[PDB]
């Protein structure tokens, strides 16, 4: 019911990250259980949760493509991209810190999906 929103938070939300370098990515990807198999790309959104939720309303969002929403405001983000040939741990990640608007899918006014294509 709210399980998708809570899984969005686990996969894509980190309120106040510690130094957004490769070691941040390798650590947080483990902590969030995204390392079996190694997820190929994943982006974390920083700042407060309320700004992300607001994308689902007209406050901080517009409709986008087929049933996505795109934010009006820009977010501090960090993209972890897997390096090395192997799908399996240890999972080495290159971090790319970014600042831009983001694309989500909303369900019941909650974000339940992050569109990763924009960070590739």
Author numbering: 2 to 121
Sentences from the paper on this structure:
In addition, the crystal structure of human ANG has revealed that it has an RNase A fold and the catalytic triad (residues H13, K40 and H114) is conserved.
In the native ANG structure F100 and V103 residues (located on β5 and β6 strands respectively) are in close proximity to the substrate binding site involving residue E108. The results from two variant structures F100I and V103I are analyzed here and both the variant residues are well defined in their respective electron density maps. This provides some structural explanation for the altered catalytic activity for this variant.
